[PDB]
Amino acid sequence: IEIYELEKGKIGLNYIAKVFSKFVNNNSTRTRIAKLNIQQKLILCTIIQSLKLNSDATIDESFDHYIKAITKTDTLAPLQRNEFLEICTILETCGLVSIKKTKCKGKTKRFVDKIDVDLDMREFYDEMTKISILKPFL
Amino acid sequence: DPGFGSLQRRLLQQLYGTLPTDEKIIFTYLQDCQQEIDRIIKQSIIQKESHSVILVGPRQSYKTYLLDYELSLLQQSYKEQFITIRLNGFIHSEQTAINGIATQLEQQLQKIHTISSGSLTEVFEKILLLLDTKITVVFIFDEIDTFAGPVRQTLLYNLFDMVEHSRVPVCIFGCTTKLNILEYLEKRVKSRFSQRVIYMPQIQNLDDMVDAVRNLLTVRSEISPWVSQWNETLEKELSDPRSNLNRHIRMNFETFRSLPTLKNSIIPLVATSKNFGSLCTAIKSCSFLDIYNKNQLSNNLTGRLQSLSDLELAILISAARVALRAKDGSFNFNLAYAEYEKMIKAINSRTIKLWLKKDVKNVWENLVQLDFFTEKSAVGLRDNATAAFYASNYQFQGTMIPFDLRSYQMQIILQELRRIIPKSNMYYSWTQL
Amino acid sequence: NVRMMLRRSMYKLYSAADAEENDVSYDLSLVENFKRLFGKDLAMVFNFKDVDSINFNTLDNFIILLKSAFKYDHVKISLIFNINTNLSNIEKNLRQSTIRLLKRNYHKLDVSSNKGF
Amino acid sequence: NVTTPEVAFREYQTNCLASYISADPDITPSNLILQGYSGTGKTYTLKKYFNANPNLHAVWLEPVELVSWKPLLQAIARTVQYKLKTLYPNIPTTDYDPLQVEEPFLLVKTLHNIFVQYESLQEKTCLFLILDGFDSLQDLDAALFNKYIKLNELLPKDS
Amino acid sequence: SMQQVQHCVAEVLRSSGYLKKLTNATSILYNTSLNKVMLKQDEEVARCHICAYIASQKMNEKHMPDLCYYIDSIPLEPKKAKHLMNLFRQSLSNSSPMKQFAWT
Amino acid sequence: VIRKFTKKNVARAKKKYTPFSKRFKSIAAIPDLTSLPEFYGNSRFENKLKTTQKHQIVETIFSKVKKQLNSSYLPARENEFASIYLSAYSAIESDSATTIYVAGTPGVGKTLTVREVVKELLSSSAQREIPDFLYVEINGLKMVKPTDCYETLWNKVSGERLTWAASMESLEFYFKRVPKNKKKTIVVLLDELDAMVTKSQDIMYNFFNWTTYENAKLIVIAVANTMDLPERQLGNKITSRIGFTRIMFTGYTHEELKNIIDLRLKGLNDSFFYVDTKTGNAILIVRKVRLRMSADAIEIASRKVASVSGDARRALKVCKRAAEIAEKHYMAKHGYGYDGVQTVHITHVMKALNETLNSHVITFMTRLSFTAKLFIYALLNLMKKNGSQEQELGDIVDEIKLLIEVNGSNKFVMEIAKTLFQQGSDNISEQLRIISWDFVLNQLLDAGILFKQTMKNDRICCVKLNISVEEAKRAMNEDETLRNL
Ligand SMILES: Nc1ncnc2c1ncn2[C@@H]1O[C@H](COP(=O)(O)OP(=O)(O)OP(=O)(O)O)[C@@H](O)[C@H]1O
Ligand SMILES: Nc1ncnc2c1ncn2[C@@H]1O[C@H](COP(=O)(O)OP(=O)(O)OP(=O)(O)O)[C@@H](O)[C@H]1O
Ligand SMILES: Nc1ncnc2c1ncn2[C@@H]1O[C@H](COP(=O)(O)OP(=O)(O)OP(=O)(O)O)[C@@H](O)[C@H]1O
Ligand SMILES: [Mg+2]
Ligand SMILES: [Mg+2]
Numbered sequence A: 001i002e003i004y005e006l007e008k009g010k011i012g013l014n015y016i017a018k019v020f021s022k023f024v025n026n027n028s029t030r031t032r033i034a035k036l037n038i039q040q041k042l043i044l045c046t047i048i049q050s051l052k053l054n055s056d057a058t059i060d061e062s063f064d065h066y067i068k069a070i071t072k073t074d075t076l077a078p079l080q081r082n083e084f085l086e087i088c089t090i091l092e093t094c095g096l097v098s099i100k101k102t103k104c105k106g107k108t109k110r111f112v113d114k115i116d117v118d119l120d121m122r123e124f125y126d127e128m129t130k131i132s133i134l135k136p137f138l
Numbered sequence B: 001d002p003g004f005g006s007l008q009r010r011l012l013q014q015l016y017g018t019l020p021t022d023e024k025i026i027f028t029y030l031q032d033c034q035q036e037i038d039r040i041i042k043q044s045i046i047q048k049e050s051h052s053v054i055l056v057g058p059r060q061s062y063k064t065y066l067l068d069y070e071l072s073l074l075q076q077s078y079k080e081q082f083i084t085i086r087l088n089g090f091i092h093s094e095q096t097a098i099n100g101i102a103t104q105l106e107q108q109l110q111k112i113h114t115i116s117s118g119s120l121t122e123v124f125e126k127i128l129l130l131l132d133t134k135i136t137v138v139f140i141f142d143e144i145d146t147f148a149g150p151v152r153q154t155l156l157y158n159l160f161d162m163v164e165h166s167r168v169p170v171c172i173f174g175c176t177t178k179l180n181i182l183e184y185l186e187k188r189v190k191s192r193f194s195q196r197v198i199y200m201p202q203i204q205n206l207d208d209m210v211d212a213v214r215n216l217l218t219v220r221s222e223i224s225p226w227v228s229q230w231n232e233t234l235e236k237e238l239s240d241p242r243s244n245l246n247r248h249i250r251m252n253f254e255t256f257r258s259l260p261t262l263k264n265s266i267i268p269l270v271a272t273s274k275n276f277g278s279l280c281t282a283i284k285s286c287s288f289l290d291i292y293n294k295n296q297l298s299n300n301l302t303g304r305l306q307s308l309s310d311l312e313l314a315i316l317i318s319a320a321r322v323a324l325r326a327k328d329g330s331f332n333f334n335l336a337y338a339e340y341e342k343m344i345k346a347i348n349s350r351t352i353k354l355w356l357k358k359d360v361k362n363v364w365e366n367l368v369q370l371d372f373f374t375e376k377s378a379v380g381l382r383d384n385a386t387a388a389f390y391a392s393n394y395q396f397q398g399t400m401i402p403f404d405l406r407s408y409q410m411q412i413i414l415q416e417l418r419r420i421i422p423k424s425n426m427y428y429s430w431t432q433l
Numbered sequence C: 001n002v003r004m005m006l007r008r009s010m011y012k013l014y015s016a017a018d019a020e021e022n023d024v025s026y027d028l029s030l031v032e033n034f035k036r037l038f039g040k041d042l043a044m045v046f047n048f049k050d051v052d053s054i055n056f057n058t059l060d061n062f063i064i065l066l067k068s069a070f071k072y073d074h075v076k077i078s079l080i081f082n083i084n085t086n087l088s089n090i091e092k093n094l095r096q097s098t099i100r101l102l103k104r105n106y107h108k109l110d111v112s113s114n115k116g117f
Numbered sequence D: 001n002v003t004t005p006e007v008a009f010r011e012y013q014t015n016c017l018a019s020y021i022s023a024d025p026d027i028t029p030s031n032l033i034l035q036g037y038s039g040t041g042k043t044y045t046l047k048k049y050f051n052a053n054p055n056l057h058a059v060w061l062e063p064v065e066l067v068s069w070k071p072l073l074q075a076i077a078r079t080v081q082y083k084l085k086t087l088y089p090n091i092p093t094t095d096y097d098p099l100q101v102e103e104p105f106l107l108v109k110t111l112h113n114i115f116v117q118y119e120s121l122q123e124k125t126c127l128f129l130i131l132d133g134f135d136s137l138q139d140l141d142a143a144l145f146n147k148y149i150k151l152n153e154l155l156p157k158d159s
Numbered sequence E: 001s002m003q004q005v006q007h008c009v010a011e012v013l014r015s016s017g018y019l020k021k022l023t024n025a026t027s028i029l030y031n032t033s034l035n036k037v038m039l040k041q042d043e044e045v046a047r048c049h050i051c052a053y054i055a056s057q058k059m060n061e062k063h064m065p066d067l068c069y070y071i072d073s074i075p076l077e078p079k080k081a082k083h084l085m086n087l088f089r090q091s092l093s094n095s096s097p098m099k100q101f102a103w104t
Numbered sequence F: 001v002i003r004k005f006t007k008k009n010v011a012r013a014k015k016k017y018t019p020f021s022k023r024f025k026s027i028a029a030i031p032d033l034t035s036l037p038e039f040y041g042n043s044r045f046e047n048k049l050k051t052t053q054k055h056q057i058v059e060t061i062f063s064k065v066k067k068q069l070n071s072s073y074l075p076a077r078e079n080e081f082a083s084i085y086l087s088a089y090s091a092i093e094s095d096s097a098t099t100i101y102v103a104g105t106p107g108v109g110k111t112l113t114v115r116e117v118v119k120e121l122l123s124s125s126a127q128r129e130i131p132d133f134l135y136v137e138i139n140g141l142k143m144v145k146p147t148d149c150y151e152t153l154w155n156k157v158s159g160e161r162l163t164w165a166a167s168m169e170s171l172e173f174y175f176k177r178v179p180k181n182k183k184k185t186i187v188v189l190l191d192e193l194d195a196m197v198t199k200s201q202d203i204m205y206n207f208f209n210w211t212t213y214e215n216a217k218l219i220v221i222a223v224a225n226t227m228d229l230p231e232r233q234l235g236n237k238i239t240s241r242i243g244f245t246r247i248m249f250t251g252y253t254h255e256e257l258k259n260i261i262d263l264r265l266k267g268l269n270d271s272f273f274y275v276d277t278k279t280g281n282a283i284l285i286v287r288k289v290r291l292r293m294s295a296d297a298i299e300i301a302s303r304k305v306a307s308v309s310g311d312a313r314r315a316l317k318v319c320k321r322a323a324e325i326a327e328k329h330y331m332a333k334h335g336y337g338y339d340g341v342q343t344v345h346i347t348h349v350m351k352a353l354n355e356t357l358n359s360h361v362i363t364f365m366t367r368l369s370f371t372a373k374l375f376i377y378a379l380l381n382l383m384k385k386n387g388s389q390e391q392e393l394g395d396i397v398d399e400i401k402l403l404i405e406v407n408g409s410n411k412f413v414m415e416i417a418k419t420l421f422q423q424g425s426d427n428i429s430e431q432l433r434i435i436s437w438d439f440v441l442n443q444l445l446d447a448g449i450l451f452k453q454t455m456k457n458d459r460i461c462c463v464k465l466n467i468s469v470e471e472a473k474r475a476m477n478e479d480e481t482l483r484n485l
């Protein structure tokens, strides 16, 4: 009834589907990756690779991995740590990367910024396959 | 000589920064920072704009000095326009900061012309009723990082919400040592904060330190008949690049890069002079600065090693070589005494009194007390009182076994002992393994 | 720990001195101001029950803490150590400075039921 | 204007104590540390310095007798109030209780209330609080000394 | 990528000399544009082209007045392309990295 | 009687303990609470911050822009506004109890939209087309205790002051047992809902379970920061009671941010002021000076802020910071004080956007002394050698000593070695640590550059870099001595 009298008789079956579409944000990783540019996609790939090889990684270790990959491959120009962090928050705004604040589990346990990913690998690799200048980072 | 006493007292006043406000010394490399602070304060106290800003710099990098100078400068011309709430993150906790704000608000509003009464809920409600022409409230909040914890930043939320949405003009000056202070903030707190961060200037080059020493030691008022001769002597020493002051300033620039460190040595150089000629001789020779530097290093590992007796040195050497032969570096009293008795027999076979095991216990306890050995895998002094309380309510396994079985690790190793024990000492050949 | 030993000792001291004849801090300054609060000298006798069960580092630090009351003219302190093992057992679990401290005025006495049968 | 006594092998230390400790609060540091191991004559030199300058107002606290931080704060409040009562007996004072100090903030408030009722004095004076054996506190942490370092900034400047 | 910047500079216009200088510019200007100028999914397909055209104006003002360039190579609407390229010029043609790129 | 400890600073409020269920002897004994003189809302601190203005302050050409761009002063939120308003209006007019869940990122206009909804609802109630209601605002981050909301809401309803437990059974009795004809509708804004989440989750259950009561006439509008909060932190009961419908406030697009900034810059942009050249004070309509802030600058700032957060607070603050940079340059040029065209250009907007991006950490490490740089160089050398992220301090001491004693033939090392190990002085013996070793260690610990573990043996204690390794490398090889070797 809320949608029916916000958009204006017996109300239809289509308004039930409109309810189930309006209050379920069915965001796809396809649509999220497709709204990025080449540099945000590249930094997303380096973040994915750094979490693949370390999986308890800080912002600064992921930036180190990004610098090592971008000097190994030499695509565009390397970024400074704060610009890397800003693009990480851009990926938060898009909804692909989350940065939390957690304790370490080493000999010097303090709180650090940590990257988690909530995206599924299959459509991520499928979208990143179609870009030729990104496959050194896959 | 009352003239030399007046000159000495003025020199000490300039070194402690306790001149009147119109005579206070701002270093050259510090104008660009302080003018910026001078803008923000004057936009809040005078023009009634709300501001929040964090000063970021190391300890003794003139954050408190510049802020106090700004508040004392605005005190003499706009006295009724503003009040000051001072909070310190070491002293105030999350609960006691509320009572500190309420008490300071009451005692400052009774000074310009209750909130403080009741439980903590009522005090916080009265503060938010008060704070959510006008009088500018200036918050000077030292150690902003301690209230920027990962659990809940309630006070920072409320204070930055006061800066944003309240119609009372509020100035907040946080201060910290943490370079990445913006990442400490929670998303809503960071959103409400202006994200204006002022980084304190550092000393970049040597004649900044030379000019700061010149500003510290030049008497710019005519209060003594010795003023002109002192100024000529100081300018002659500071202009000559091979003088002893320039050597000590260069040494400070290359090791500490700290003007408070230099002032802590310059103050007893001035204060121990009996007359003007002694002061000029002291400032030319800088011989007191070498005695000062020797005293500041008199209780480190080298001086404590030089204070040791011959039996103390023998026990320390034996423990060091046992620790070097060990895998984890661990040793106890028994193995150290076995090494000691083998070493004394091998000396006497080529006459040193061999002390019994019941007498080496006192030497061992003296060596533990003088921080030459530490207990194996010992935390030591805890960071906060809660962890210290938890450690005090627990009995460690080392304090229940006998003293001759306790595992220790060395604070100094055998190579350093070989380096700083003299060649003519008769225990020297035992420093090699 | 030492803090609990001092707190219980000062609470017992204040309780006894109130029962024998405003609140105070339960630390050794109560021993410092004893003549100003009660007008009398202080003779403290410490009975350490079952010393062969107490932590020896804690007992050592408590004895070093009690040494600080020797600068007050109105205080004298007695210590009673209840031993069931040997004297040398407690002598090698205490630091040698504490042993030198206890050696100035010490007596031994056998308590056990097989004393001369 | 201070007397430097003769200590037999602590001449440099006694000269430094003459350099740092004086009755004028402008040319005196807020904090001063004497560091040395046991039996090095720290207490002996400090007593000979303060006995040779009887005009200096000193309060002596032993943290070893206090053991924890809360009795140290209460002892600070009690001893400062008693010394200021003995020093200026013709100044009427409200007797604030030492036992209401449970936080460092409450010590700041109590010291404010004690020092604000001595403004009838004609000259600025120093009160030297000597914590003889600070790290001999039994329940010591790394954060306690920071509060005592920063304590002077929460007290008024024109007191 | 060299092929995209080469094709974009080519079709904005009409080796390793002056066209090489222009390619090097479009690349630096595009790389800093990726960080400081944000476009949506439509406008992004002309981030190279617009950047290329900016470098073209620089040549026309600095060394060679005879160089020719036209606007409609940009695959957006010419009003939208005009607005975007004015936005790009005014924003980061005075940027501090893009000040010591010798145009000679 | 002698106490074992004392509590000498107890402050207890004057709160009664008897709840509302025991005020009257029966359900029929309760009167119409809308007529009671204390119920339903039926400040003394505002004059305390008044003083005497004896000066005349100068408001310049950019002063009105900076004052007008503040957060204290509804274009892009009209579907969310319509949804919240229609749900709340239907709940008020039918005498129903309803939960409205609103979630979003910071600064996207959640509190502003809910407040505008309740202002239009109160205006609609003032025209006597919906029944009158009481509006209660509870912010979870403005409470000392989480249970104080029980204290707050009941105090807004009855005017009594009780403890939190008695307030909780008072609210339960009021919402369930009292009939609709004796009650008034209550609209509660619960803002910062996550701050009111406890381990027991009793406050969540109570506040959302009162909306399931027939007699309650309670409308709870809960504001969250995430949409998955009831699934992640709350149980299935509270998630079921909150409901399937959940209003998400998306981050603003750059068109919406530009519309917000242009709405605040209507009447000031492309306008003329009368400006005094003697003092600097400017009056909105002596010189006639035109003020502009360019639309390209606003669109650059809006696009950057919309991609990073979509936050209206950041867009307004970036515009205000750009205007303050321009106004600082203006006062520097004309020599004005704090007692034909002026433009906020795009360069000020780029400076405002770059001042939070410029990475002072590298600059800080560049402007350190030689001993601190030598420490960082030695630590980086150990991480290169043995490949570990944590290095023992004794290893750093030994490799500093090796770095001094191997490249001795460098002229700077021949100048610095006597300073490093003897402080330039005979009669000072050779030192095991360098001069200012603990000083630079504590200085790097204060900055957050270093992490040190808590051990009492200084040699086996570990040190880790908290900052990224590449920025430490570029700061180190900026130094001419350290990059030479
Ligand atoms: N009000 C003051 N008057 C005079 N000198 C002062 C004043 N406050 C500080 N100083 C001096 O200024 C120097 C710099 O120390 P300052 O207190 O300003 O440090 P800070 O930068 O605030 O550091 P921290 O982070 O440790 O608080 C010191 O020599 C100190 O004695
Ligand atoms: N320079 C000296 N001249 C004469 N007697 C001295 C001197 N130094 C120390 N003494 C004597 O040695 C005793 C021990 O010195 P003191 O109590 O001052 O040491 P300390 O460094 O304060 O020790 P601790 O840290 O153990 O308290 C003094 O009480 C005094 O009798
Ligand atoms: N649509 C809008 N039109 C005008 N100004 C707006 C709009 N949205 C937000 N603002 C501005 O942004 C400020 C902050 O917004 P608001 O307090 O509503 O944020 P919020 O989403 O509740 O954030 P938080 O989660 O931090 O509480 C408002 O006070 C107002 O100045
Ligand atoms: Mg400070
Ligand atoms: Mg002593």
Ligand SMILES: [Mg+2]
Binding pocket: F110, F111, F191
């Ligand atoms: Mg809000």
